Design goal:
Chain C: This is Spike protein S1. The complex is a heteropentamer of chains A (204), B (213), C (193), D (209) and E (211). Chain A has 204 residues and is mainly β. Chain A is built from 1 helix and 17 strands. Chain A folds into 2 domains: 109 residues, Immunoglobulins (Immunoglobulin-like), CATH 2.60.40; 76 residues, Immunoglobulin-like (Sandwich), CATH 2.60.40.10. In chain A, 3% of the residues lie in helices and 42% in strands. In chain A, strand 5 and strand 6 form a beta hairpin. With 213 residues, chain B is mostly beta strands. Chain B has 2 domains: 113 residues, Immunoglobulins (Immunoglobulin-like), CATH 2.60.40; 87 residues, Immunoglobulin-like (Sandwich), CATH 2.60.40.10. In chain B, a hairpin with a 4-residue loop joins strand 18 and strand 19. In chain D, a hairpin with a 5-residue loop joins strand 12 and strand 13. With 211 residues, chain E is mainly beta. Chain E contains 2 helices and 19 strands. The chains are: A mainly beta (204), B mainly beta (213), C mainly beta (193), D mainly beta (209), E mainly beta (211). The complex binds a molecule of 2 linked components (NAG-NAG).
Chain lengths: 204, 213, 193, 209, 211
């Protein structure tokens, strides 16, 4: 009913710098008797449930680092993290509790900020070839930031799926796996990431 | 919703009597056909008797003159008085709602009637110590009568990899049963495994600890 | 601290039609006594939270007290309708505070009826929020003037609760305390520790 | 403070009924309202409804009122979210949050409950190898989740296990890759794939062809 | 009586396939046939009445066909919950009769058994009876040959076998063979061996122990 839009969707900030997440409201979230905007900020680390950080858009919860701070009034609100650390890496939501039903924002991912080229590297196994399905896998081991095209004898679709891992504190990078999916057939993998598109192939 | 709850099963000597009750819900017992269907252990289904909505009663040949079917309208309960019981009558008796003496659209949970001259006896529990990867252990439940027996491990905390084998009727007339589990071989010295054996016909509860020799 | 004890632990409570209000200000209050307790049958709060309210400030806090039946406690809430809500005690839709109620069968129920706890039964228009009507004027249900005497189309506006210890839980009296919190743009006189 | 504990993981089928639990233990549950939040697979939080245990006053989101039911039992300090006819779209993880009143922030959160509904059985995975002139294993066509893949029985340290992907066949696929060409000389590598929902433990050997 | 014969006795199909079950009568019953389902440990559940009509709450994947002396029940898109014993019952003539039943199991890959052998406990040995237990764990198909060989001599007539139903997670069976002997007979031999023959085994597997 009362909408809540965030910006940006994704953000990468180096350690020791400032992060800024905006939250726009369809209506004013200000009460008459309390004169405080009923907005809350939440942090959801991977695998863990969301944790409340800031309520009333200005007041911080107990046990919250002093670097987290809230600001804004009316329909425009923001969350600022100064001196960013690795612990602050999570998806952040702004939620209104002015009146039921409660609404959340779409979420804001906080990634980590050197650009690394991807290491491109798989023929279908003979054991799987007996089963009647041929799987071809292309690997990007470590690269940052988070374009794979399958070449079927130099012919370009829809026979592959992508799975991307998540970066960690150690060696912050990304890994992508594209698994091309039939005994009727049976092969190049073209990757364009930030200097020329590499193309590793194999023959039957 | 339709409910049929049965009671009265147990162990009875040959020639003895037993009455089976079937509490009914969701329909009037006076206005519907009701039937009793028994199933011998491991065998198929066999119709026993039927009571018509108007009160007419009919029985199978093997039970005619010994079994009497009756209903209690006030209690909404269907009864089956079994008399002159024989060993061949040993079966799981079901309570079924009959549609026009044609088919049984609703069944009860079934109660076990065992007819034998054998005497109730509590089970004896013996360990199955693991041999010297994956290690297998279990408990041996031997020489008990009558059915059933419930076996648990670590008071229900251990349920994965547990295989409780069906009971087998020995030559002595007493059932035997085994329950085995699969556990990592590392936990033999550390973890402690106990099998909970309960035989309510004999009021026997045994908690047996198993450990390698 | 602030005189919360004088309100909750008051010897006698007022009728719902003549609900008392105590102005609590210019004092430092401890709210731990309330939410830690379990004698409160219902502890419903709108806008504010008694937990985390200890380290907060407010410009003005009101403590409204009255006695109603168990069935009528549900009416002490924003956007609620009923004889108590419409004619005795009405809360605004933007109400910020708490409503606290507990059973008082041992205190307010008497054998043969209390005769002293009253609620308004007849009223031509609904009460505005936080409005108290203590009129005993004879209700005129017709066009004939009543001249202050009960009779046909002329009823007494107030009805007496027949509070007895042998009634059901719903019929038993309940003591209700309503806390209203204001944080106007002004110096804050009511603060916690 | 106060704490919340939810029910366990459950996998169901389209057309079954499910009821999940959220019991609160702490100090002052009389002041607390309990809500329900749904997070679809790899998506954001969605607010479903809220309830006050003392009087069971239940408020529903307009997008969830017609197909969910929230209840509570103040005797056991537990809230319940229940469905009658589950759907494949209901597959998500459900959180319950506790606030000390209406129009208040959600101070206390539960650990979450995972729900999976799909028109598929519990078929186990098939493990196929994935070297060149960079080892890996392919875990394909399994349901339900999850599949825990290890390397060399713990220890190795260079393992990048990719998240599972739902294929058009209704089943999942997963692969893990490990990167030192000196290991390909004479150091054997074995991948351990365990699928507890299917009790499948495959330790396949990956060798250069 | 009129005898109902169901074929096949046991049917093994992978989930998602189509199952056809037959039921033939001694005499014509003219669509007065019913179908039932019975999971292990539960009561029969009505599936089809009138030989074609579907009972309330039954999924559309169950269809009744046939009339007179020949009847068929077809189950499409086999789900795990659809694996049980199915009986056919006639009501065209009195007495009403059922069939022997058809068991619909789940088909899977051939799994070799895990063989474990358990010597009798010392506590049981005091009572004068010794029981040797051999375990076949998590195997498929159900067909398996267990032979007791004591001092390399085959033993017969003193062993009983028990097989569990298909596990709810693995579509595999488990078999237990128990050899029962008196203490005197048990102590008259040294080596007790359990030999297992199965489709998933290249050669028979023997687990043994010394008394
Ligand atoms: C009303 O009086 C009672 C009795 O003195 C108070 O209840 C006690 O409160 C103290 C703290 O003031 C607690 O330590 C005790 O455990 C309470 N005892 C019981 C039996 O409840 C109560 O707090 C008073 N209420 C107010 C609002 O002042």
């Amino acid at each position: 009913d009362i909408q809540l839009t965030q910006s940006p969707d994704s953000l990468a900030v180096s350690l020791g710098e400032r992060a800024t997440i905006n939250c726009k409201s369809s209506q004013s979230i200000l009460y008459s008797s309390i004169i405080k905007n009923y907005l809350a900020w939440y942090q959801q680390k991977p695998g863990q449930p969301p944790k409340l950080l800031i309520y009333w858009a200005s007041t911080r919860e107990s046990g919250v680092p002093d670097r987290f701070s809230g600001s804004g009034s009316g329909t425009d609100f923001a969350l600022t993290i100064s001196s960013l650390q690795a612990e602050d890496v999570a998806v952040y939501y702004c939620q209104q509790y002015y009146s039921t039903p409660y609404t959340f924002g779409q979420g804001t991912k906080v990634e980590i900020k050197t650009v690394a080229a991807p290491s491109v590297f798989f023929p279908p196994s003979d054991e799987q070839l007996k089963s009647g399905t041929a799987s071809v896998v292309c690997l990007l081991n470590n690269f940052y930031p988070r374009k794979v095209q399958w070449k079927v004898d130099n012919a370009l679709s829809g026979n592959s799926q992508e799975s991307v891992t998540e970066q960690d504190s150690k060696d912050s990078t990304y890994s992508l796996s594209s698994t091309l999916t039939s005994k009727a057939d049976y092969y190049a993998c073209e990757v364009t990431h930030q200097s020329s598109p590499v193309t590793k192939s194999f023959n039957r | 919703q339709v409910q049929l709850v049965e009671s009265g099963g147990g162990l009875i000597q040959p020639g003895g009597s037993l009455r089976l009750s079937c509490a009914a819900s969701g329909f009037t017992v006076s206005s519907n056909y009701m039937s009793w269907v028994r199933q011998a252990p491991g065998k198929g289904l066999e119709w026993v008797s039927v009571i018509y909505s108007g009160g007419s009663t009919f029985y199978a040949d093997s039970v005619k003159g010994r079994f009497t079917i009756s209903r209690d309208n006030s209690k909404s309960t269907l009864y089956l008085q079994m008399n002159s019981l024989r060993v061949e009558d040993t079966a799981v008796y079901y309570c079924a709602r009959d549609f026009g003496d044609f088919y049984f659209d609703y069944w009860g949970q079934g109660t076990l009637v065992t007819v034998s001259s054998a005497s109730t006896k509590g089970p004896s529990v013996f360990p199955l110590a693991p041999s010297s990867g994956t290690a297998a252990l279990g408990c041996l439940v031997k020489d008990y009568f009558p059915e059933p027996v419930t076996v648990s491990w670590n008071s229900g905390a251990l349920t994965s990899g547990v295989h409780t084998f069906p009971a087998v009727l020995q030559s002595s007339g007493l059932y035997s049963l085994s329950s085995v589990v699969t556990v990592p071989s590392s936990s033999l010295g550390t973890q402690t495994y106990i099998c909970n054996v309960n035989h309510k016909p004999s009021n026997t509860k045994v908690d047996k600890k198993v450990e390698p020799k | 601290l602030c005189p919360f004890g004088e309100v909750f632990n008051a010897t006698r409570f007022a009728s719902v039609y003549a609900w008392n209000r105590k102005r609590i200000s210019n004092c430092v209050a401890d709210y731990s006594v309330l939410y830690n307790s379990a004698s409160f049958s219902t502890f419903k709060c709108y806008g504010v939270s008694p937990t985390k309210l200890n380290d907060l400030c407010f410009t003005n806090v009101y403590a409204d007290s009255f006695v109603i039946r168990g069935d009528e406690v549900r009416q002490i809430a924003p956007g609620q309708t009923g004889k108590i809500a419409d004619y005795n005690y009405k809360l605004p839709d933007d109400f910020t505070g708490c409503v606290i109620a507990w059973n008082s069968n041992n205190l307010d129920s008497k054998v043969g009826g209390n005769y002293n706890y009253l609620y308004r039964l007849f009223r031509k228009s609904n009460l505005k929020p936080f409005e108290r009507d203590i009129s005993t004027e004879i209700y005129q249900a017709g066009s004939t003037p009543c001249n202050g005497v009960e009779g046909f189309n002329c009823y007494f506006p107030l009805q007496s609760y027949g509070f007895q210890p042998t009634n059901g839980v719903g019929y038993q009296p309940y003591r209700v305390v309503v806390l209203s919190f204001e944080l106007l743009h002004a110096p804050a006189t009511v603060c916690g520790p | 403070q106060m704490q919340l504990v939810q029910s366990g993981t459950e996998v169901k089928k389209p057309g079954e009924s499910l009821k999940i639990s959220c019991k609160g233990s702490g100090y002052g549950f009389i002041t607390y309202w309990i809500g329900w939040v749904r997070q679809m697979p790899g998506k954001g939080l969605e607010w479903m409804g809220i309830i006050y245990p003392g009087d069971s006053e239940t408020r529903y989101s307009p997008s969830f009122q017609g197909q969910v039911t929230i209840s509570a039992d103040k005797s056991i300090n537990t809230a319940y979210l229940q469905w009658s006819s589950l759907k494949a779209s209901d597959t998500a993880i459900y959180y319950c949050a506790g606030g000390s009143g209406i129009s208040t922030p959600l101070d206390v959160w539960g650990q979450g409950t995972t729900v999976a509904v799909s028109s598929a059985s519990t078929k186990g995975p098939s493990v196929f190898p994935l070297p060149s002139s960079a080892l890996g294993c392919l875990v394909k066509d399994y349901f339900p989740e999850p599949v825990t893949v290890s390397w060399n029985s713990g220890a190795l340290s260079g393992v990048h296990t990719f998240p599972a992907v739902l294929q058009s066949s209704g089943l999942y696929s997963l692969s893990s890759v490990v990167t030192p060409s000196s290991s390909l000389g004479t150091q054997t590598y074995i991948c351990n794939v365990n699928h507890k929902p299917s009790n499948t433990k495959v330790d396949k050997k990956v060798e250069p062809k």
